């Protein structure tokens, strides 16, 4: 592997993304704002050399929903290794649905999609998921996490629509609250014609070459998640991926599971909570040490 893109920081980092401002594809109670409005609302910036991307935790929400940003990289990658070092990620906040992921080019779901860091509400464990067209299932080995769903197809029979094929990390510090309390860590994601692997290195435990000029995944510990096997054409189900950061609220996932988990008591429904409790979302932010993409 060799470096192909060091995303830098602050404005140089933001220049590498298009800010999505359309209504949320996942129907959340979110108001994705432009870069200028986000900077004016303090949702994006630089914090001591780190890149910050958060949500409005000040104002009662109105309009489409609570203000946030969704950045989609201008560049795409066919195959490669995406390494992100985060000092902080959106917390395990009720009503939230943060995600750092990649989305293939072309019509959904034919380009495939990879959820590297994702969860909802008060989740504890990171949930790594793939989303593809039909004809793509994964094996049970080569990873430390626990497989929850094996079919990556958006309409896998018996699975909720777009639940995808997901593996749940075993470390309670792999997401939200726990992750932030340890000062974050590093998530490395490798995309090859034979599958996808995602490693989670909690702060301090990362390999010595993960942030360097030639990271070599082959020598790293077992990944937290691995998507591979003959039940999928890894090369054909995934085309060029673009990197995406977002934090939405309620919507298709978080809003539909709100009333069953531990957040149900905070409010009648997800929307009312997100609308009337701005201060709840102070922890819903990404704080990037670095984002580097490599190619074979």
Ligand X SMILES: OC[C@H]1O[C@@H](O[C@H]2[C@H](O)[C@@H](O)[C@H](O)O[C@@H]2CO)[C@H](O)[C@@H](O)[C@@H]1O
Q: How far is the CB of 11 from ligand X (least distance, A)?
A: 29
* Helix residue spans in the chain (DSSP H): 10-14, 35-40, 176-181, 256-257, 270-276
Contact present, 99 and 244 (Cβ < 8 Å): yes
Does 81 bind ligand X (CB under 6 A)? Our answer is: no
Residue of 36, 141, 160, 213 that binds ligand X (CB under 6 A): 160
Q: Residue 162 CB: number of other CB atoms within 10 A?
A: 17
Residue whose CB is less far from ligand X, 248 or 290:
248
122's tokens: 């008060």
Collapsing DSSP to helix, strand or coil, 75 comes out as strand
Residue of 22, 157, 158, 161 that binds ligand X (CB under 6 A): 161
Tell me the window of 72-80, 181-189, 248-256, 280-288 that interacts with ligand X (CB under 6 A): 248-256
Does 163 bind ligand X (CB under 6 A)? Our answer is: yes
Which positions from 121 through 150 interact with ligand X, judged by CB under 6 A? Answer: 129
Residue whose CB is less far from ligand X, 115 or 206:
115
Q: How far is the CB of 171 from ligand X (least distance, A)?
A: 19
Residue of 124, 239, 256, 269 that binds ligand X (CB under 6 A): 256
Residue of 190, 246, 252, 283 that binds ligand X (CB under 6 A): 252
Tell me if the bond preceding 243 is cis, omega within 30° of 0: no
Tell me the window of 54-62, 81-89, 155-163, 237-245 that interacts with ligand X (CB under 6 A): 155-163
Contact present, 30 and 65 (Cβ < 8 Å): yes
Contact present, 195 and 227 (Cβ < 8 Å): yes
Size of the site for ligand X (CB under 6 A): 12
| Residue 211: closest CA among 288, 290, 116, 287 | 290
Q: 94 Cβ partners below 8 Å, 6+ apart?
A: 121, 122, 258, 262, 263, 266, 273, 280
What are the residues binding ligand X (CB under 6 A)?
26, 115, 129, 160-164, 252-253, 256-257
């Amino acid at each position: 592997y060799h470096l192909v893109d060091d995303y830098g920081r602050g404005n140089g980092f933001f220049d590498k993304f298009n800010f999505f401002t359309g209504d949320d594809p996942t129907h959340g109670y979110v108001d994705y704002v432009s870069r200028d409005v986000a900077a004016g609302a303090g949702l994006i910036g630089e914090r001591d050399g780190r890149t910050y991307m958060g949500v409005d935790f000040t104002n009662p929400a109105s309009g489409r929903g609570r203000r946030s940003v969704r950045l989609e990289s201008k560049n795409t990658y066919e195959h490669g290794l995406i390494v992100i070092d985060l000092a902080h990620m959106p917390g395990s906040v009720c009503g939230t649905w943060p995600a750092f992921w990649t989305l293939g080019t072309g019509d959904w779901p034919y380009g495939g999609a990879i959820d590297i860091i994702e969860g909802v509400n008060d989740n504890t464990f990171n949930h790594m998921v793939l989303h593809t067209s039909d004809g793509c299932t994964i094996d049970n080995d080569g990873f430390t996490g626990n497989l929850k769903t094996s079919n990556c197809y958006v309409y896998a029979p018996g699975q909720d629509a777009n639940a995808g094929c997901g593996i749940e990390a075993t470390d309670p510090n792999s997401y939200g609250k726990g992750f932030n309390s340890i000062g974050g860590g590093i998530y490395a994601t490798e995309i090859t014609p034979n599958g996808i692997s995602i490693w989670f290195f909690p702060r301090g435990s990362e390999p010595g070459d993960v942030l360097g000029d030639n990271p070599n995944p082959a020598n790293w510990d077992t990944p937290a998640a691995k998507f591979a096997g003959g039940g999928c054409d890894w090369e054909g189900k995934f085309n060029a991926q673009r990197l995406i950061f977002d934090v939405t609220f309620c919507g298709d996932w978080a809003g539909n599971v709100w009333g069953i988990g531990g957040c149900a008591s905070r409010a009648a429904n997800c929307v009312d909570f997100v609308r009337d409790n701005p201060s709840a979302f102070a922890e819903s932010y990404w704080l990037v040490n670095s984002l580097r993409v490599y190619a074979p």
